[PDB]
Amino acid sequence: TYKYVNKKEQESEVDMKSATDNAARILMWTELIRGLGMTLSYLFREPATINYPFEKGPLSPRFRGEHALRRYPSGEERCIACKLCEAICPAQAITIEAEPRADGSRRTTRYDIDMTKCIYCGFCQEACPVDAIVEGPNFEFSTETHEELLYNKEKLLNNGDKWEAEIAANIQADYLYR
Amino acid sequence: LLKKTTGLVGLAVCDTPHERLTILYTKTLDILKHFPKHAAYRKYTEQITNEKLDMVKAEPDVKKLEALLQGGEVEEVILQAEKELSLARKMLKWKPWEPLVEEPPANQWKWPI
Amino acid sequence: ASNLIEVFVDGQSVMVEPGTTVLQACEKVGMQIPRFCYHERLSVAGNCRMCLVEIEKAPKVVAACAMPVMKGWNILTNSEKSKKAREGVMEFLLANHPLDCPICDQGGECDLQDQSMMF
Amino acid sequence: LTLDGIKDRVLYVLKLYDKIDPEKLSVNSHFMKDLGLDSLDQVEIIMAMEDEFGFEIPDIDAEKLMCPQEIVDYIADKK
Amino acid sequence: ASATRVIQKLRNWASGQDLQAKLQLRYQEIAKRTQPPPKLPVGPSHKLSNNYYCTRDGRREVVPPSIIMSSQKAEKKAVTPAPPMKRWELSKDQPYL
Amino acid sequence: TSVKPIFSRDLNEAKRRVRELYRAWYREVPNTVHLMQLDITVKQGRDKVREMFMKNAHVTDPRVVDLLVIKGKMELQETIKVWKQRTHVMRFFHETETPRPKDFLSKFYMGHDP
Amino acid sequence: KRPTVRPRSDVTHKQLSAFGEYVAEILPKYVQQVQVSCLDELEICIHPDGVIPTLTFLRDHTNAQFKSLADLTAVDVPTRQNRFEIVYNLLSLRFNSRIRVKTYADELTPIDSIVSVHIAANWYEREVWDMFGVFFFNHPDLRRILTDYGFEGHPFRKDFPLTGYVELRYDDEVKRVVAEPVELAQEFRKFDLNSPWEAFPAYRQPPE
Ligand SMILES: CCCCCCCCCCCCCCCCCC(=O)OC[C@H](COP(=O)([O-])OCC[N+](C)(C)C)OC(=O)CCCCCCCCCCCCCCCCC
Ligand code: SF4
Ligand code: SF4
Ligand code: FES
Numbered sequence: 001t002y003k004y005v006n007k008k009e010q011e012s013e014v015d016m017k018s019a020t021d022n023a024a025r026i027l028m029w030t031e032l033i034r035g036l037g038m039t040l041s042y043l044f045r046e047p048a049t050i051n052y053p054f055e056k057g058p059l060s061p062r063f064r065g066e067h068a069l070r071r072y073p074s075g076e077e078r079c080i081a082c083k084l085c086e087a088i089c090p091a092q093a094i095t096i097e098a099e100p101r102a103d104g105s106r107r108t109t110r111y112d113i114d115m116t117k118c119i120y121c122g123f124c125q126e127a128c129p130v131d132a133i134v135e136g137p138n139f140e141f142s143t144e145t146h147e148e149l150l151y152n153k154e155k156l157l158n159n160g161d162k163w164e165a166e167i168a169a170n171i172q173a174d175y176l177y178r
Numbered sequence: 179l180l181k182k183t184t185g186l187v188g189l190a191v192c193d194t195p196h197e198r199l200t201i202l203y204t205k206t207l208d209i210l211k212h213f214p215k216h217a218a219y220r221k222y223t224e225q226i227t228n229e230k231l232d233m234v235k236a237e238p239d240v241k242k243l244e245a246l247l248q249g250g251e252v253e254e255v256i257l258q259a260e261k262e263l264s265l266a267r268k269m270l271k272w273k274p275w276e277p278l279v280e281e282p283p284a285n286q287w288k289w290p291i
Numbered sequence: 292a293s294n295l296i297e298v299f300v301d302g303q304s305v306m307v308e309p310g311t312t313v314l315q316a317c318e319k320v321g322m323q324i325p326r327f328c329y330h331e332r333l334s335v336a337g338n339c340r341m342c343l344v345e346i347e348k349a350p351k352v353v354a355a356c357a358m359p360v361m362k363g364w365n366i367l368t369n370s371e372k373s374k375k376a377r378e379g380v381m382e383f384l385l386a387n388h389p390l391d392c393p394i395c396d397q398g399g400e401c402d403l404q405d406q407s408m409m410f
Numbered sequence: 411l412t413l414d415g416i417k418d419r420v421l422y423v424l425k426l427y428d429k430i431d432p433e434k435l436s437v438n439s440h441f442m443k444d445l446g447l448d449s450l451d452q453v454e455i456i457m458a459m460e461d462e463f464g465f466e467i468p469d470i471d472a473e474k475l476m477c478p479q480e481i482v483d484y485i486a487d488k489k
Numbered sequence: 490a491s492a493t494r495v496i497q498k499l500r501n502w503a504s505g506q507d508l509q510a511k512l513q514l515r516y517q518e519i520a521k522r523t524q525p526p527p528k529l530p531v532g533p534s535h536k537l538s539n540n541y542y543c544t545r546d547g548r549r550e551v552v553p554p555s556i557i558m559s560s561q562k563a564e565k566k567a568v569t570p571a572p573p574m575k576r577w578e579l580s581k582d583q584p585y586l
Numbered sequence: 587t588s589v590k591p592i593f594s595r596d597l598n599e600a601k602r603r604v605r606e607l608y609r610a611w612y613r614e615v616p617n618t619v620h621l622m623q624l625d626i627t628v629k630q631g632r633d634k635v636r637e638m639f640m641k642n643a644h645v646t647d648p649r650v651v652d653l654l655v656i657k658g659k660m661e662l663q664e665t666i667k668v669w670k671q672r673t674h675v676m677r678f679f680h681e682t683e684t685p686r687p688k689d690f691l692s693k694f695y696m697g698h699d700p
Numbered sequence: 701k702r703p704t705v706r707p708r709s710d711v712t713h714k715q716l717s718a719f720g721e722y723v724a725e726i727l728p729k730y731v732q733q734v735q736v737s738c739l740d741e742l743e744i745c746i747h748p749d750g751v752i753p754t755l756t757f758l759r760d761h762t763n764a765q766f767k768s769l770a771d772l773t774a775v776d777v778p779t780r781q782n783r784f785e786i787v788y789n790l791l792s793l794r795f796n797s798r799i800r801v802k803t804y805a806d807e808l809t810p811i812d813s814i815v816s817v818h819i820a821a822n823w824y825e826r827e828v829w830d831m832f833g834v835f836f837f838n839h840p841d842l843r844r845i846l847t848d849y850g851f852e853g854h855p856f857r858k859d860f861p862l863t864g865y866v867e868l869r870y871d872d873e874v875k876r877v878v879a880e881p882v883e884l885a886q887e888f889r890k891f892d893l894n895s896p897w898e899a900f901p902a903y904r905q906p907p908e
Contacts, residue, residue: 003580006182034505041504044496048514058522082393092393092889107393114886176527218725222567226762248573249762249794258762265760272753274729279747281560283781286804287745289732290903291779321907324871324900369901374543399893450636454604457612469605520718524850547705550731552902554735555744569743569763570719571712590809592835603710625874647806656835660843661850669848673877682871684879 005145012152024099033154059137061170064122066138067113067151068167070131077157085124085133093117095125108153115149134160136167181240182196184253196253203231204260209266223266230259254255299347299365305325313355313366314342322368325377325406327384329356339384341406343376365379377410411489417482423458424478437478452476459485492515590651596619600651601615604639618665622672623699626679719797720744722763739844747804748761748811754801757816758790762784766790768797772824773816774832778858782806783865785832788814813842831856862888 012018024030050057070078081098097110124133136159145151151159160167181191183206183250206227230247237243240252249255285291295306300320307316312335314324327339335357343352347365352372360366367373385407392404417437426434430445441447441455456472463485475481490512500508524586556562563572594600618624624631631689642654664670687693693700713736720734720742728752734854735743746754758766770789782804790799805811813836814821825836825844835855837843844851853860867877898904 001580001582002577003583007185007585009585037503038505041500041508043502044492044503044510046492046514072569080394083398084393087891087893095886148786175525177529201822219727222722222726222763223761225567230762250576258765261760262762265757268756269753269762274750274753274757276729278560278732278748279729281805282732282745282747284561285780286782287559287802290905291777322901322904325897370542374546375541378541378543399895402897405895405897408895409899442588449601449605450608450639454612457609461613469602469609473602482630538732545702545704547702549900549902550705550738551900552738555717557717557734557736558724558731559734560732567763568715568718568722569795570792570799571715571795574794574796589766592808647808653808653835664843664849674849676874676876677879681874682876683880 012053019038023077047057061137061174063137063139063170064120064125064135065140066136066159066163067118067124067156068134068136068163069153069156070134070160070164070167076105077107078095079108080106080110080130080132082129084127084129088117088123089120089129090121090123091117093119111153111156113151113156114147115151134171135169137170138163179240181251184251186251186254189257192253192256195241195243195256196234196238198256199234199252199259200231202228202256202263203234206263206266209270210261212270214275219266219269219275221268223262232254254288296360296362298360298363301368302365310359312357312359313344313346313353313364316360317344317355317366317368324355324368325410327402327406329336340380341374341377343380345372345376346368370393375408381407381410411486413482413486416485416489417478418473420459420478420482423462424455426456427458434471439479490514589649592649593655594648594652597646597648597651600648600655601657604651607655607662608635608639610662611658614662614665618675621668622675624676626676638678666684703877708738708902709740716740716742716797719799722757725870727757728756732847741798741800743800743802746804748805748809751801751803752812752814752817755788755790755814758799758801759817764792765794766792766797768793769814769818769820769824770798772821774828774856776832776858780804782809784832786811786828786834805834810837811836815840823853830854833857 010096062096072078074106081096083096083098086092086094086096093114095110095112095114096108098106100106120135122135125131125135128134138159180193184191207224210220210224210227233246234243237246244250244255247255249258256262292306294308296309297304298307298316299305300317300322303320305316307319311319314326314329317324324344325341328336329340329342337354337357340354340360342355343351344355345367347348347367355366373390388403392398392401395401397404414415421435421437424435429447429451436444439445441452442470452475453469454474456467456475458482460467465488471484475484490509506573512555534545587612594603612635615635616628618629619626619631628632645651645654665675673695687696714737720736723744724731724734726905727746727750730746730753731744732747737743744754749829758764768791770791771787773787773789775785775787777785780858781851782808784805785802786805788801790801792798794852803811811834813825815825815838817876822840823845825839826842828834829842830844830846831854847855855864863882864886867881867882868877868879870876
């Protein structure tokens with residue numbers, strides 16, 4: 001179906017009362033005054049402004065923030081150099097090099113994420129089979145040099161160690177949906 | 179009665195839609211008589227024009243004429259008749275009933291490669 | 292047809308030498324029969340049963356890597372019976388196969404993975 | 411038509427063309443077989459004529475103008 | 490929500506709408522940020538029998554396009570790509586603004 | 587060996603269009619240098635134009651010459667109306683690029699590039 | 701019935717086949733192929749000489765009424781003699797249908813522009829020329845529309861590199877934005893994501 005937004009159904013004829021109404025409207029600015037009034041109503045409303053940085057905007061456990069590399073409760077790195085995150089990374093922002101470790105475990109010797117290349121899409125954290133790479137809820141990590149946003153494995157492990165008290169909680173909250 | 183507005187911007191309302199439609203269809207048929215008899219365009223356009231002209235001659239009411247034509251409003255039908263007449267003139271100039279001008283290479287329309 | 296016999300793959304006729312297997316006739320036509328144990332430079336084993344195909348007017352599916360075509364055989368390769376046989380054999384392999392794909396060197400080089408996704 | 415003036419003013423702009431020397435240039439000199447020029451050099455002299463005279467010259471006439479005789483009588487019977 | 494009644498009346502008169510009934514700011518009606526754990530259902534293919542993939546393989550039902558006529562392979566009524574479009578009915582809910 | 591022409595039936599009319607385009611570029615170059623503040627001189631721009639024409643000057647196919655004329659006219663009118671800016675027109679000269687040496691000894695010292 | 705498979709209406713296939721026969725017999729001079737996909741879309745492959753007559757017939761015919769050009773695009777398949785495939789998708793509002801008209805070109809055979817038939821073809825053909833190098837005859841203003849000024853080469857071709865040949869950076873010596881030969885700090889790593897097993901037997905090409 002459809003409807004008209006500007007067509008007038010029939011006409012309201014030409015009345016002297018309607019003429020006087022239009023004359024009052026475009027001589028005494030009635031629509032202007034009512035616009036003024038409702039703008040005044042917004043003046044007398046309460047503003048929607050939060051007090052950053054002392055107040056923070058609401059988020060979700062699904063939020064995709066800063067990348068981190070997680071660990072098992074034993075303490076070993078969850079990553080097993082399986083390279084699906086690099087294969088699925090749509091910006092090619094992940095570089096992984098690997099070799100067998102001194103105990104024979106399959107581990108990464110290089111795990112680099114270019115945050116200036118990354119698009120923050122979570123494809124890595126939804127392709128990770130062991131929940132190693134995650135996108136934790138940190139977003140206030142803006143730097144002053146372009147180099148500092150070129151993360152390596154030590155930076156990502158430090159981020160995972162820093163945010164584990166919250167990343168694991170978010171994964172516990174939201175893992176049943178995924 | 180007479181239509182107030184046709185609802186489409188830039189389209190004028192036709193006071194006498196029947197006479198305009200019948201002269202447009204007659205002119206289209208007349209320009210279709212110059213085509214070769216074996217022209218499929220001539221055959222199909224003559225069928226379409228003949229059926230539309232019979233509907234205009236049958237129905238003198240604009241509303242039920244529009245409902246019979248099923249081409250939107252009668253102004254739209256008049257404009258479509260104008261476009262069909264200009265098209266038929268161009269098709270007579272172009273002569274596309276002739277055989278295929280050139281076959282393509284053998285892998286031109288092969289997908290996937 | 293000098294020392295050659297006529298067979299059919301999906302109704303398409305092809306000349307083959309006597310002694311040609313169903314798999315070899317199929318790849319002569321240009322279709323690759325799924326396999327795990329057949330290798331063209333090894334001896335024929337016939338154990339993995341991935342190459343089971345349906346011959347027309349035959350009730351039991353045959354192993355394409357080992358069975359030689361006789362005469363006039365219509366090898367239905369994409370038939371319902373062949374697809375069911377491939378699905379069953381793939382199910383039996385992946386029943387006891389271990390969930391080791393991320394820690395395995397056959398990342399994109401795995402016949403088991405590729406033939407799983409294909410059949 | 412001031413034939414002498416247009417003639418020596420043509421030779422004057424050939425003198426100020428940089429690529430050719432002032433030595434072996436003659437009134438009957440040829441651009442490619444004698445002066446060793448190119449086609450784009452030839453149209454450089456033609457457009458030098460055009461913007462030093464103030465009247466437009468077509469490429470059809472420019473292809474014909476190859477030696478100073480046809481240049482000078484072309485501008486003579488064009489003016 | 491914390492506005493006085495005088496300010497509420499002034500806002501309502503100045504705007505012409507009941508602003509307190511539809512507040513722009515969310516106070517308590519939103520859902521709790523901590524929710525009970527879900528249990529997502531499974532689809533129709535989550536069955537242990539009568540579920541062969543060849544009976545629901547929609548990706549392999551795609552066929553190459555059928556050639557109506559070709560330059561190498563190849564009294565009736567004039568036709569249309571489709572039956573003509575029916576006119577839209579005017580809305581019985583609110584036909585005009 | 588029988589093809590469809592674009593604009594020129596043969597190479598003579600193609601050369602005619604080439605001469606017209608060269609004349610128009612030669613007329614434009616002083617106006618370009620005056621209009622957008624170029625560090626180059628008027629003579630150097632015309633030498634650049636002629637070097638471009640000599641780079642393209644090895645072709646014999648009339649369709650290729652016609653398309654080259656069309657591209658030259660597009661770049662020409664793109665210089666007529668001020669769209670191709672000072673940086674865009676200075677990209678023809680490559681002042682900030684070290685020219686690669688052409689001799690085998692320096693190409694050997696520089697790296698593995700043949 | 702099957703929740704994972706699209707429902708297919710055969711009436712659209714029949715109607716599009718009938719209209720394909722209709723158009724093919726009205727224009728045998730230009731039409732080289734007519735096909736309807738299993739997705740129920742009509743594709744009509746024509747000679748490049750009949751682009752303007754075919755588009756004009758489809759725009760102005762009473763039974764076609766394809767008054768809206770959905771888009772004009774090109775596909776580079778660099779294994780054919782005429783590597784560019786020009787595709788016109790058209791929408792018929794009166795009959796509520798869609799058609800696709802295909803033609804071919806290469807780097808040295810221009811095709812006629814249809815700006816006189818559709819005015820959107822102006823910018824669409826400008827984009828096609830800028831991306832593929834297909835010249836269009838009688839275009840009122842044919843020039844680049846998306847690439848940088850002075851850009852060399854047509855980037856949507858298959859043989860044009862993804863990162864291109866030059867890159868822009870600010871040079872403080874000349875105080876300019878100069879273009880230099882491209883160098884990548886990290887090279888784009890191409891991936892061989894092709895399974896060596898056949899996926900669709902319905903498209904198995906015969907052996908050569
Ligand atoms: C000094 C204290 C403050 C006063 C002002 C308070 C603030 C008001 C602010 C309102 C919002 C203004 C924002 C800017 C608006 C700009 C547009 C605008 O104003 O357009 C003007 C508009 C213009 O109207 P328009 O733009 O629609 O054009 C009309 C023409 N058409 C529609 C065909 C295009 O109105 C006027 O120009 C009228 C001005 C006021 C005239 C009042 C006349 C009253 C009667 C006169 C006396 C008659 C009796 C004589 C004695 C008889 C004795 C017996
Ligand atoms: S969020 Fe996306 S773009 Fe960023 S590293 Fe992960 S896969 Fe790559
Ligand atoms: S997907 Fe996970 S386990 Fe695999 S390489 Fe990436 S971070 Fe490591
Ligand atoms: S390939 Fe293993 S049984 Fe034939």
